[PDB]
Coordinates of C-alpha atoms and ligand atoms in Angstrom, one line a residue:
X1 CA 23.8 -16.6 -20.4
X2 CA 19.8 -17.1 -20.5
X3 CA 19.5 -13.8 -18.9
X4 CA 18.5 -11.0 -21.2
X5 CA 21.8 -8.4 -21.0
X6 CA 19.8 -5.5 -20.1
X7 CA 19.4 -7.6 -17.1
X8 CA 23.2 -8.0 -16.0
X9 CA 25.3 -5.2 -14.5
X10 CA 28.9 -6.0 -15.4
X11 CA 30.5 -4.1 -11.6
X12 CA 34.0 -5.6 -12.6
X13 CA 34.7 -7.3 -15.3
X14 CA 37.8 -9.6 -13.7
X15 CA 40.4 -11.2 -15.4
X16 CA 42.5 -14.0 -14.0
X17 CA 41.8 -17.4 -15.3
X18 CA 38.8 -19.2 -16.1
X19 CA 37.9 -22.6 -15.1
X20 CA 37.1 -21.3 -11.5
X21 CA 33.9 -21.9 -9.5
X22 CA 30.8 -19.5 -10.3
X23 CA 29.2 -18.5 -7.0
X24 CA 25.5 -16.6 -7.0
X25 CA 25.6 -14.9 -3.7
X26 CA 21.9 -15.1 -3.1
X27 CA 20.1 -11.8 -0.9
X28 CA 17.0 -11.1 -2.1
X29 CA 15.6 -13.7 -4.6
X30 CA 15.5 -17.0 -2.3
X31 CA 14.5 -19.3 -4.8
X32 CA 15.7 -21.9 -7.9
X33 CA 13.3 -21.5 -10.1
X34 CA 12.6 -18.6 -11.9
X35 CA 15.6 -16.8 -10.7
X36 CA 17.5 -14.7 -13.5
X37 CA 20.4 -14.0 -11.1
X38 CA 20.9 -17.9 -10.7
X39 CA 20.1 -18.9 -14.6
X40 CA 23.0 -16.0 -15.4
X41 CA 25.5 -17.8 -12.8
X42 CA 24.7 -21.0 -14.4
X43 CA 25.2 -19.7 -17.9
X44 CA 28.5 -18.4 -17.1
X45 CA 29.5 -22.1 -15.3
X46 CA 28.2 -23.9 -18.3
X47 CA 30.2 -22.1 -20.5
X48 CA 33.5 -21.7 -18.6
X49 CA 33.2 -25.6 -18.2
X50 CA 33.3 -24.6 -14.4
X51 CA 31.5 -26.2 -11.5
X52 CA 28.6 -23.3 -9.8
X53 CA 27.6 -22.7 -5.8
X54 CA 25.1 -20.9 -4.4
X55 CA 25.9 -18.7 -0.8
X56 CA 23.8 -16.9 1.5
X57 CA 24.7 -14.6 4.1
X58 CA 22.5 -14.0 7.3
X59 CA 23.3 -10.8 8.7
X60 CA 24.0 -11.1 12.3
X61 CA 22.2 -9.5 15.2
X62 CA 20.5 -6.5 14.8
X63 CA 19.3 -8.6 11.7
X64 CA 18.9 -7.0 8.4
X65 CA 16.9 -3.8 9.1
X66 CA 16.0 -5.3 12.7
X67 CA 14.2 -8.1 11.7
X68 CA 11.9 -10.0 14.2
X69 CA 11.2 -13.7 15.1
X70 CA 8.3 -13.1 12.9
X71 CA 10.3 -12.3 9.9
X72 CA 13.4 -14.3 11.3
X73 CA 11.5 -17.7 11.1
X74 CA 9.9 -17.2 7.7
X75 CA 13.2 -16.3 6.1
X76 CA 15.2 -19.1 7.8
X77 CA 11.8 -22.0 7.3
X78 CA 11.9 -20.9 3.7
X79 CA 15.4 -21.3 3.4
X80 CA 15.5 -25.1 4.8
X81 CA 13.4 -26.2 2.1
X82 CA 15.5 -24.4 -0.6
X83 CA 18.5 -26.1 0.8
X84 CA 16.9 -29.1 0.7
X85 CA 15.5 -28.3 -3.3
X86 CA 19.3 -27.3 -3.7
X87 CA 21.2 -31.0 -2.6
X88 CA 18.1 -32.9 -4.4
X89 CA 19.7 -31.3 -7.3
X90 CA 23.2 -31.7 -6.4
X91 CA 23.7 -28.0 -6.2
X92 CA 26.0 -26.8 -3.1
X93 CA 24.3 -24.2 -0.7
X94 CA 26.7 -22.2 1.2
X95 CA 24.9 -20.8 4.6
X96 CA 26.5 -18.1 6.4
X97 CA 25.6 -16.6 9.5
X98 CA 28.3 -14.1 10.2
X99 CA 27.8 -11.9 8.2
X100 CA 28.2 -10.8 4.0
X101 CA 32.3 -10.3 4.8
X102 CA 32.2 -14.7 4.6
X103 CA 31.1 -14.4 0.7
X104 CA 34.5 -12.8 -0.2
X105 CA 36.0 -15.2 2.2
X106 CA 34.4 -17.8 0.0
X107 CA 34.7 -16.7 -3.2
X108 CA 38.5 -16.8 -2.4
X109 CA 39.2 -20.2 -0.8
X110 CA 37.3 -21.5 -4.2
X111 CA 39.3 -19.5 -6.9
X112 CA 36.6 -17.8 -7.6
X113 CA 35.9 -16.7 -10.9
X114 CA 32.6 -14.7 -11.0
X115 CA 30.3 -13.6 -7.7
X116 CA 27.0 -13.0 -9.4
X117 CA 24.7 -11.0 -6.9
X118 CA 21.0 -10.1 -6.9
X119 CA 19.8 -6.6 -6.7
X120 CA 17.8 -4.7 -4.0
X121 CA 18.1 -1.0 -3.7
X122 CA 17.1 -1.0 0.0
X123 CA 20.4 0.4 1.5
X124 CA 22.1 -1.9 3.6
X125 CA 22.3 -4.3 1.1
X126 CA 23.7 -1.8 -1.6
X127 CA 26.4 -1.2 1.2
X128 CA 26.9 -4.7 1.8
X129 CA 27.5 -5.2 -1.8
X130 CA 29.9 -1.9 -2.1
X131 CA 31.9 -3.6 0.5
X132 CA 32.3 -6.9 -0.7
X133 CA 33.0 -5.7 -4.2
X134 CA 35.7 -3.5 -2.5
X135 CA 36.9 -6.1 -0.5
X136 CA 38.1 -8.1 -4.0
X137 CA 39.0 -5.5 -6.0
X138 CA 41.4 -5.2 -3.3
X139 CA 42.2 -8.6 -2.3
X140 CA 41.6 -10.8 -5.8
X141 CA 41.0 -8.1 -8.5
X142 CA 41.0 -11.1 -11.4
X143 CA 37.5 -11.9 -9.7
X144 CA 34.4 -10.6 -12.1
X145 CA 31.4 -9.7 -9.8
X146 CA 28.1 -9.2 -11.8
X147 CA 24.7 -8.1 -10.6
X148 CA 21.7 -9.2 -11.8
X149 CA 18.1 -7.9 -11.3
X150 CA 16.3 -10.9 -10.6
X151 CA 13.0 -9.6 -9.1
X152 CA 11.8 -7.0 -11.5
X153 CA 10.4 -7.5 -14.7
X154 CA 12.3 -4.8 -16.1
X155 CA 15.3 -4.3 -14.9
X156 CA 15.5 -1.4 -12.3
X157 CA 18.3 0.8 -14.7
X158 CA 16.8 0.0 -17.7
X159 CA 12.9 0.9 -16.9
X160 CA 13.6 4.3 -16.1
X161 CA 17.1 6.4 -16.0
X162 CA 15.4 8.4 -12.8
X163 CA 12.9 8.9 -10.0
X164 CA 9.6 8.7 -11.7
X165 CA 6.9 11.0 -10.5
X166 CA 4.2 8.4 -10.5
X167 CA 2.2 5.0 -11.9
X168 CA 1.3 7.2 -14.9
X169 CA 4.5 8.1 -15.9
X170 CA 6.4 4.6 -14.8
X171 CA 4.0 3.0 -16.5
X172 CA 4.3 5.2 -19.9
X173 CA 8.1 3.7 -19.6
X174 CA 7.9 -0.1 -19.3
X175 CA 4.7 -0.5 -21.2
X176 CA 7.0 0.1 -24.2
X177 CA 9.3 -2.8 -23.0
X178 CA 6.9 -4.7 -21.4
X179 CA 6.6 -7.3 -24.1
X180 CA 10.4 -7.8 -24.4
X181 CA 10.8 -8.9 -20.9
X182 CA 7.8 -10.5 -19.6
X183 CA 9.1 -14.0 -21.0
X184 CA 9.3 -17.1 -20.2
X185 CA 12.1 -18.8 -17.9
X186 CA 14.4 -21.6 -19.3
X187 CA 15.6 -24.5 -17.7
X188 CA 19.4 -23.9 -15.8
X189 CA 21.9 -25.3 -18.1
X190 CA 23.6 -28.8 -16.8
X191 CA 26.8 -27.8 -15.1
X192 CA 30.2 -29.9 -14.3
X193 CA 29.4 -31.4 -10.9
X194 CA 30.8 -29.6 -7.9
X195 CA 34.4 -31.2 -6.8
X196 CA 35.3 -28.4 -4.5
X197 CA 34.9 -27.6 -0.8
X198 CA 31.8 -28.7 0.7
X199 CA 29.4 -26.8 2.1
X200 CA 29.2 -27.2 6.5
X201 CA 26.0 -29.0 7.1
X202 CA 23.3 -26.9 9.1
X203 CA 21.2 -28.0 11.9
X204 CA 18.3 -25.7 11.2
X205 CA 16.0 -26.7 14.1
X206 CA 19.3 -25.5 16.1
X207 CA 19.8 -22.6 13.9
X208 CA 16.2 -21.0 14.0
X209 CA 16.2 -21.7 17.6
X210 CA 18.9 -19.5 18.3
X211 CA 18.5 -16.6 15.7
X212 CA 14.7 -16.2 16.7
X213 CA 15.7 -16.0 20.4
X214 CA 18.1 -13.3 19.6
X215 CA 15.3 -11.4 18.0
X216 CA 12.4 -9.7 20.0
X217 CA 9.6 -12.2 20.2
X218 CA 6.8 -10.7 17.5
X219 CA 5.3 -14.5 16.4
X220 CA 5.7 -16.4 13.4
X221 CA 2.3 -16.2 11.4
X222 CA 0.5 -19.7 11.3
X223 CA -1.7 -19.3 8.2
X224 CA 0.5 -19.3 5.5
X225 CA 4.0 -21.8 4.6
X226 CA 6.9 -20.3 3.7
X227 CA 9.1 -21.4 0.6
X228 CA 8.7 -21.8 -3.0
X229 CA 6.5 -24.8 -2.9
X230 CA 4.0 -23.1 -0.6
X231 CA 4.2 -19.9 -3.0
X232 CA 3.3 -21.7 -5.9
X233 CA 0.5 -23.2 -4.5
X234 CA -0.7 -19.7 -3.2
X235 CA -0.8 -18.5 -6.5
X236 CA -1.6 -21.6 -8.8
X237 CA -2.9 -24.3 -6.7
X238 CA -6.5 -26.0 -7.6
X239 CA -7.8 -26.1 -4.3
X240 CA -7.7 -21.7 -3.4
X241 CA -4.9 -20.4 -5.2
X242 CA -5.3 -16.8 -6.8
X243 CA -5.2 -17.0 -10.2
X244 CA -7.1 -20.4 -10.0
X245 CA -10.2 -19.4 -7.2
X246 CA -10.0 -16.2 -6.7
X247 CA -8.7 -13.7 -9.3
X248 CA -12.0 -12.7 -10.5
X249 CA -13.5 -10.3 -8.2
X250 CA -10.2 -8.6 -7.3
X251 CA -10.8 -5.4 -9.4
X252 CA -14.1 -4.8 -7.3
X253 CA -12.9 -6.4 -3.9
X254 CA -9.9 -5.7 -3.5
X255 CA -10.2 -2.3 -1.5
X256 CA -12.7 -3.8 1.1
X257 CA -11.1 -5.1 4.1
X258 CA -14.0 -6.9 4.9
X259 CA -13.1 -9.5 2.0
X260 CA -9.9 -11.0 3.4
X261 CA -9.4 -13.7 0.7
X262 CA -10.0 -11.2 -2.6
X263 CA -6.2 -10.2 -2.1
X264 CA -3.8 -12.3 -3.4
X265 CA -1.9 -12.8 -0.8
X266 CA 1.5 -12.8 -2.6
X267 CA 3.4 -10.2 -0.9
X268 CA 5.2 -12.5 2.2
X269 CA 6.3 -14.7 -0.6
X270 CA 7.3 -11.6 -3.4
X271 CA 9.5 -10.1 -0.7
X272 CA 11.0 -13.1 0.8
X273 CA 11.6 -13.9 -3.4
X274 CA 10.0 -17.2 -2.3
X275 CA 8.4 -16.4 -6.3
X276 CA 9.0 -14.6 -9.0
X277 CA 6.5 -11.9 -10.0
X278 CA 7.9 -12.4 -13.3
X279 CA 6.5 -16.0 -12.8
X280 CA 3.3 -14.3 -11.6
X281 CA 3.0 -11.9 -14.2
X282 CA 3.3 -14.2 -16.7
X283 CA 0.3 -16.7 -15.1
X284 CA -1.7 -13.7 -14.8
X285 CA -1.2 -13.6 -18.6
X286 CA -2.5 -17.2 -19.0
X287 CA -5.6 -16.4 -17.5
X288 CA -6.4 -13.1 -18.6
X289 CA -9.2 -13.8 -21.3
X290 CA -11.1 -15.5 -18.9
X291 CA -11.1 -12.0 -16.2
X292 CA -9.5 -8.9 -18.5
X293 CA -10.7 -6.3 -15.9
X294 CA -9.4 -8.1 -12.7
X295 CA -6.2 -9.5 -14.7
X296 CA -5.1 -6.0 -15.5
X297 CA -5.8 -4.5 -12.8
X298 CA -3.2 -7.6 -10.5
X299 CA -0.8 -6.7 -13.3
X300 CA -1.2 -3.0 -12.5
X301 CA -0.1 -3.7 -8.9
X302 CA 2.5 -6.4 -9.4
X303 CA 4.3 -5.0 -11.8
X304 CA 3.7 -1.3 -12.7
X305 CA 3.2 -0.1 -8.2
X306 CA 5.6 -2.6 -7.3
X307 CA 8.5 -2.2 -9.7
X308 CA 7.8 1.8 -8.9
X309 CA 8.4 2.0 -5.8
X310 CA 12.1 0.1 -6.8
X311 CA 12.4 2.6 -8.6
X312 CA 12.2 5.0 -5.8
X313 CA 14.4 4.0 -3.4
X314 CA 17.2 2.8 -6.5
X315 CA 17.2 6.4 -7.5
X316 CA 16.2 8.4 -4.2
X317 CA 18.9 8.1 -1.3
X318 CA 16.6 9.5 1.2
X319 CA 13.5 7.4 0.7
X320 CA 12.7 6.7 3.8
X321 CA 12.7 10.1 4.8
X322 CA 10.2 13.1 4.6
X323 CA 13.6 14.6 2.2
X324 CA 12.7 12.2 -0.2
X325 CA 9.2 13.1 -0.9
X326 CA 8.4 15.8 -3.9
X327 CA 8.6 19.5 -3.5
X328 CA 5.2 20.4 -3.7
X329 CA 5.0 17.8 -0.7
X330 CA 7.4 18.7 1.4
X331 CA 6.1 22.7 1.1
X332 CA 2.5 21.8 2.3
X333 CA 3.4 19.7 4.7
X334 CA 5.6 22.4 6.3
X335 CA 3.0 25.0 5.5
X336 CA 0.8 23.1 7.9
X337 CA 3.3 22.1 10.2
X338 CA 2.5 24.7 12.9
X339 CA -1.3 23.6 12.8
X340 CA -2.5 21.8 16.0
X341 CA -3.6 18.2 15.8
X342 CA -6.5 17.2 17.7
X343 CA -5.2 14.6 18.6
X344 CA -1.3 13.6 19.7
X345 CA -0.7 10.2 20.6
X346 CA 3.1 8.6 21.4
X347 CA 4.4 5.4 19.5
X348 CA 3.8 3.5 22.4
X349 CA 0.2 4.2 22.2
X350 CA -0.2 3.7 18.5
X351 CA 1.7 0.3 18.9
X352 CA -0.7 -1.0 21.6
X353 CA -3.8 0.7 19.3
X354 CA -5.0 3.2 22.3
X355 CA -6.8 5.6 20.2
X356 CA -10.5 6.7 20.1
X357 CA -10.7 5.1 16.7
X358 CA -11.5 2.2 16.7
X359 CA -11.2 1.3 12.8
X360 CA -7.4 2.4 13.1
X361 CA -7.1 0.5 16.5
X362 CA -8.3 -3.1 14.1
X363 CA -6.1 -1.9 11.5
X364 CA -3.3 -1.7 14.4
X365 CA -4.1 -5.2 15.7
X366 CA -4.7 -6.8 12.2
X367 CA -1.0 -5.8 11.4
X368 CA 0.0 -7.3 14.9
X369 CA -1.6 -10.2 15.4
X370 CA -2.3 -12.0 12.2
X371 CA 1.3 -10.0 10.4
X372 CA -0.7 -8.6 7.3
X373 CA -2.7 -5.7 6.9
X374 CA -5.2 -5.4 4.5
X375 CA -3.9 -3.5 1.8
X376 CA -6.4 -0.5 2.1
X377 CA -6.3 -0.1 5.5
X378 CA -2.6 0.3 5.0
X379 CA -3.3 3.6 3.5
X380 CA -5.9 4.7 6.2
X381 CA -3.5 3.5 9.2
X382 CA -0.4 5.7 7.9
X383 CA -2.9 8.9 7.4
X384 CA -4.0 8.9 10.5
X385 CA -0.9 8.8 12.0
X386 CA 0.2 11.9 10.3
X387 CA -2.9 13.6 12.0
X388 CA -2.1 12.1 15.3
X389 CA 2.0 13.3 15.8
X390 CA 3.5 16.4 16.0
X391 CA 5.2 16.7 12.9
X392 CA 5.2 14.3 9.0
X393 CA 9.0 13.3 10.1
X394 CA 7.6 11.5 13.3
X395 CA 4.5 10.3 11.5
X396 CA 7.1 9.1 8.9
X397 CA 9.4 7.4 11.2
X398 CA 6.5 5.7 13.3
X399 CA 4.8 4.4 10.2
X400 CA 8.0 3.0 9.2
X401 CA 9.1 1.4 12.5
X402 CA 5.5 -0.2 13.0
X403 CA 5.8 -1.5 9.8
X404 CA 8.9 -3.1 9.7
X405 CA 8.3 -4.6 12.9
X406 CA 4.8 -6.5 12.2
X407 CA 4.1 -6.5 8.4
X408 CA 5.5 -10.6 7.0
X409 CA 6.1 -8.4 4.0
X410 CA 8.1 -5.4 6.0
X411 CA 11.5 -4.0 5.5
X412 CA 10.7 -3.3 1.8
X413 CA 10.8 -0.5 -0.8
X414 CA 7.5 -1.2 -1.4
X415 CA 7.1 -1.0 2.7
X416 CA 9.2 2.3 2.3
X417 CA 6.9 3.8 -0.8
X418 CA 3.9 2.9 0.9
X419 CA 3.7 4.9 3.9
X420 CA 5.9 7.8 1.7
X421 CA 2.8 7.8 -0.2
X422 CA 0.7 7.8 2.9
X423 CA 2.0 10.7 4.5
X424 CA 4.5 12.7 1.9
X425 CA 1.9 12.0 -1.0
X426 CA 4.5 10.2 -2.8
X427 CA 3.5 9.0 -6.3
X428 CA 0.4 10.9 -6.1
X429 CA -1.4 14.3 -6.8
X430 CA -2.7 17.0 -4.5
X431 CA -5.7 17.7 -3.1
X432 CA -7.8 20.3 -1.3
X433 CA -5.6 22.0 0.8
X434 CA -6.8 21.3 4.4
X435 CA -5.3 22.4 8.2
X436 CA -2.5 19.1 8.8
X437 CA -2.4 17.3 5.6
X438 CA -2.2 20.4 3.4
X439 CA -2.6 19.0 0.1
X440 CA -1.4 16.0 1.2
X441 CA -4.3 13.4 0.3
X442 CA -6.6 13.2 3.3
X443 CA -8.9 9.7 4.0
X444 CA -11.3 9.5 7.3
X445 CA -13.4 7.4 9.0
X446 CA -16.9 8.8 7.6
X447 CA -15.0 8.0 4.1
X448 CA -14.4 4.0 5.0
X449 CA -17.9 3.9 6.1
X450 CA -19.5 4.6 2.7
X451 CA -17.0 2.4 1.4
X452 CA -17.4 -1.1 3.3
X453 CA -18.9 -2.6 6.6
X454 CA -16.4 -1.0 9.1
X455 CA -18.1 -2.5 12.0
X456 CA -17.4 -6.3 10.0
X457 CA -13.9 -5.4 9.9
X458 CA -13.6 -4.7 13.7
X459 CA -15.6 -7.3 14.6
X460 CA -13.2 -9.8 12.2
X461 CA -10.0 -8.1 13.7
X462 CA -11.5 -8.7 17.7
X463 CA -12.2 -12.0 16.6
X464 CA -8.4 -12.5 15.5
X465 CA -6.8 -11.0 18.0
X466 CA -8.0 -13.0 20.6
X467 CA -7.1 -16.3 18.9
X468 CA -3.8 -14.8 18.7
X469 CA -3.8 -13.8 22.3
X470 CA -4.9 -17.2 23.2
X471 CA -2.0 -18.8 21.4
X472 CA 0.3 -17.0 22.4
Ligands
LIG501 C1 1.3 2.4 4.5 C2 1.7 1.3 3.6 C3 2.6 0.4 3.9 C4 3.0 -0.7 3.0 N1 3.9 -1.6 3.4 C5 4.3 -2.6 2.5 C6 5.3 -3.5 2.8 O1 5.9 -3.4 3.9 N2 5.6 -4.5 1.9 C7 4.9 -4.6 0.8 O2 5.1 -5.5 -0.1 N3 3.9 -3.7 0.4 C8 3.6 -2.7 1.3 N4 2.6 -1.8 1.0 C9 1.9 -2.0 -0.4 C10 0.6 -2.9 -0.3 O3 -0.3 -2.6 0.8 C11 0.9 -4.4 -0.2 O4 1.9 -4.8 -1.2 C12 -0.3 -5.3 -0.3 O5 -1.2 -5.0 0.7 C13 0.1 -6.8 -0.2 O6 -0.9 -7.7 -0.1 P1 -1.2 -8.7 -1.3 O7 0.0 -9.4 -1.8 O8 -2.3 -9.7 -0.8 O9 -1.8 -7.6 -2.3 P2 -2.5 -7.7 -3.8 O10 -3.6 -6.7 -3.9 O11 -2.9 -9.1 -4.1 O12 -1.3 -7.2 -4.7 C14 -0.4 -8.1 -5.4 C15 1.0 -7.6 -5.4 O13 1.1 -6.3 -6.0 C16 2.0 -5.5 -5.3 N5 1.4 -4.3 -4.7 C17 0.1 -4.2 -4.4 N6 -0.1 -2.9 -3.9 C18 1.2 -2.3 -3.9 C19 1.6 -1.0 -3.6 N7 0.8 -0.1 -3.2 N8 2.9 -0.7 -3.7 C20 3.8 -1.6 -4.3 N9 3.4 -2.9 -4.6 C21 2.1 -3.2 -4.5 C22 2.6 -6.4 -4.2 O14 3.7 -7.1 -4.8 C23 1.5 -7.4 -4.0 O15 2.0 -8.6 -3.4 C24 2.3 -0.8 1.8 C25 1.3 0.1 1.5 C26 1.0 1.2 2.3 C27 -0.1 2.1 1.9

C-alpha cells in the first residue's frame, strides 16, 4: 500500500480468500484526506481487486470517556460533512451508534477480508480494539485486521521502543527519522465500485438531537466549524488562517494569554482528526524560510510535545494516574504530602471558579464558556489546583475531570500529559524544593504578572463569559 510499513501493524494476518470487501474502521482520524489508515485500506482494495468501506462506531451512552454535548455535537457536525465528502466520492460510510461490537458484525455480513483500524493509545479504545480483534479471531479467523498509525508523524512503535523521559530525549529519537516520514500524501488508489450492502441512511439532524440530549448540556462552541473543510481553512486559508496571517509572532506570543489569535488554534480539529498534523507539519515546512524561529518552534509543539505525550500513554498503563509519573516525582510529591495547603477548595468550587484568585477563576471560565483555554494558562490552572486539594491524586483527578468535561480538545493523551506534567512534573525537570509542590515545578500569580497584562486577560474572560451566559 501507499503507507510506509513502519506504519502498519499486521494484528492478524488472516487467511481465507481474497476478493472480499476492505473495511477502515475509522476511531480517531475522521477525515479522507491525508489519512494513512484510509490510503493503506485502499491499497489493499486496489490490489485485491476488491471493492473498500469505511465504518464508524459511536460509543453509546456514557459516550467515549463521558463525552458532552459540547464534544458530542462537534464529533457528530464533523462527521455529517465527511459523510457527505464520502457519497460525493462514491465511497460507502457505515455509521454505527451501538456500539464498536457492530464493526465485527459488519465485517462479517460483507465477507470481510481485512478490518484496517486507526490507532490511539487512550484506553478504551485499545480495549475496544482487543475486543473486536478477539471477537474474529474467534468467530472468522480468515479475517486480516491491521492497524495503522494515522495521526503521528512517526509511527507511535517505531519513534521510540519506551516511555521517554522528556522533549529532549523524544526529540533525540525522531529527529533522526524525521526526514523519512514527514512526506507527502498520495492520492487513494481508484477502487472497484462498491456492489455490496448499502450503508442505512442517517438523519443527522435527528441523530444529534438525540445523542446531545443524552449527554449533560456543556454547549457546543460557536466560533469555530467543525470538519475537514473548516480545518483547512483554519490553518491555510487567505483570509486568517495560521500559517497564512498569523504564524509569525507565535514564538514570542504564544505564551501570553492576552493574544488570543497568536495560537494556532489547531487542537479541536488535531483531536477530532478533522486534519492531519502530518498535513500541518508539512505546510509548516513550506513556509518556513519566510518565519525560521516561529516555524520551528509550531513544529516543536505539533510534532515533537504532541507525538510525546502518545508516547506516554502507548507505553505507560497508568497515565492518567499520579502512578504514572516518574520516581523522583512521585517521592516529592509524597514527601510533601503531609504539608498543609493554604488553601482547600472542593471540585465543586473549582468548577464554578470560587476562589480568591481571580486569574485562575478567568482561566476556569475561559475553559467553560468559550471551550479552550489558552495554552499557558493551562499550565497555571492545573498548578494551582495541586496547591488548593488535599493530596496530587485529587489534584490529578480534578484536573482531569475538568478537563475532559470543557476543553473542545479534551479526552486526549495530550489532555492526559498535560495536567501529568502540571502536577506530577511529567516530562520535565525539578526544581527548588518547596512546602506542597516539592520539586514539583511551582508557577504563581506574581510570576504571570511580570509576564503579561493579567488584568487584560480577566477583563477579556468577564467579557466572554457574559456573552456566553447571555446565549445560553
Ligand atoms: C493542564 C493541561 C491540559 C491540557 N489539555 C489538553 C487537551 O485536553 N488536549 C490537547 O490537545 N492539549 C492539551 N494540552 C496541551 C496544550 O495546552 C494544547 O494542545 C494547546 O493549548 C492547544 O491550542 P492550540 O492548538 O491553539 O495550540 P498551539 O500553540 O497553536 O499548538 C499547536 C499544536 O501543538 C500541539 N501542542 C501544543 N502544546 C502541546 C502540549 N503541551 N502537549 C502536547 N501537544 C501540544 C497541539 O497539537 C496543538 O494543537 C494541555 C496542557 C496542559 C498544561
Amino acid at each position: 500500500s501507499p503507507a510506509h510499513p513502519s506504519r502498519v501493524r499486521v494484528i492478524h494476518p488472516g487467511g481465507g480468500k481474497p476478493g472480499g470487501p476492505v473495511v477502515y474502521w475509522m476511531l480517531r482520524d475522521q477525515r479522507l484526506a491525508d489519512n494513512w489508515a484510509l490510503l493503506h485500506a485502499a491499497g489493499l482494495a486496489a490490489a485485491s481487486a476488491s471493492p473498500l468501506a469505511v465504518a464508524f462506531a459511536l460509543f453509546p451512552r456514557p459516550f467515549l470517556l463521558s463525552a458532552r454535548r459540547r464534544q458530542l455535537g462537534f464529533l457528530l457536525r464533523g462527521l455529517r460533512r465527511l459523510a457527505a465528502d464520502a457519497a460525493a466520492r462514491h465511497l460507502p460510510f457505515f455509521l454505527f451508534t451501538g456500539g464498536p461490537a457492530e464493526i465485527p458484525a459488519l465485517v462479517q455480513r460483507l465477507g470481510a477480508s481485512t478490518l484496517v483500524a486507526d490507532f490511539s493509545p487512550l484506553r478504551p479504545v485499545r480495549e475496544a480494539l482487543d475486543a473486536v480483534v478477539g471477537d474474529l479471531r474467534r468467530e472468522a479467523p480468515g479475517v486480516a485486521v491491521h492497524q495503522v498509525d494515522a495521526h503521528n508523524v512517526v509511527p507511535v512503535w517505531t519513534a521510540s521502543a519506551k516511555m521517554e523521559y522528556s522533549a529532549k530525549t523524544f526529540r533525540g529519537k525522531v529527529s533522526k527519522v524525521m526526514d523519512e516520514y514527514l512526506v507527502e500524501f498520495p492520492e487513494l488508489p481508484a477502487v472497484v465500485p462498491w456492489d455490496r450492502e448499502q450503508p442505512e441512511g442517517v438523519d443527522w439532524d435527528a441523530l444529534i438531537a438525540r445523542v446531545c440530549s443524552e449527554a449533560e448540556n456543556v454547549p457546543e462552541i460557536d466560533w469555530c466549524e467543525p470538519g475537514e473543510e473548516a480545518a483547512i481553512e483554519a490553518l491555510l486559508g487567505s483570509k486568517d488562517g495560521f500559517l497564512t496571517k498569523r504564524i509569525k509572532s507565535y514564538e514570542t506570543d504564544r505564551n501570553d494569554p492576552t493574544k488570543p489569535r497568536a495560537l494556532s488554534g489547531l487542537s479541536p480539529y488535531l483531536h477530532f482528526g478533522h486534519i492531519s498534523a502530518q498535513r500541518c507539519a508539512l505546510e509548516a515546512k513550506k513556509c518556513r524560510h519566510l518565519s525560521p524561529k516561529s516555524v520551528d518552534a509550531f513544529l516543536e509543539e505539533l510534532v515533537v510535545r504532541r507525538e510525546l505525550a502518545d508516547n506516554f500513554c502507548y507505553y505507560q498503563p497508568q497515565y492518567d494516574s499520579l502512578s504514572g509519573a516518574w520516581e523522583w516525582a512521585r517521592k516529592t510529591l509524597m514527601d510533601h504530602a503531609a504539608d498543609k495547603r493554604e488553601h482547600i477548595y472542593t471540585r465543586e468550587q473549582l468548577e464554578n471558579a470560587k476562589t480568591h484568585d481571580p486569574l485562575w477563576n478567568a482561566s476556569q471560565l475561559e475553559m467553560v464558556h468559550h471551550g479552550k483555554m489558552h495554552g499557558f494558562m493551562r499550565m497555571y490552572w492545573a498548578k494551582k489546583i495541586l496547591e488548593w486539594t488535599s493530596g496530587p491524586e485529587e489534584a490529578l483527578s480534578t484536573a482531569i475531570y475538568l478537563n475532559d468535561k470543557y476543553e473542545i480538545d479534551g479526552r486526549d493523551p495530550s489532555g492526559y500529559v498535560g495536567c501529568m506534567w502540571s502536577i506530577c512534573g511529567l516530562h520535565d525537570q525539578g526544581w527548588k524544593e518547596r512546602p506542597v509542590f516539592g520539586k514539583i515545578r511551582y508557577m504563581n500569580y506574581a510570576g504571570c504578572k511580570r509576564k503579561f497584562d493579567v488584568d487584560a486577560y480577566i477583563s477579556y474572560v468577564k467579557r466572554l463569559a457574559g456573552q456566553s451566559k447571555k446565549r445560553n
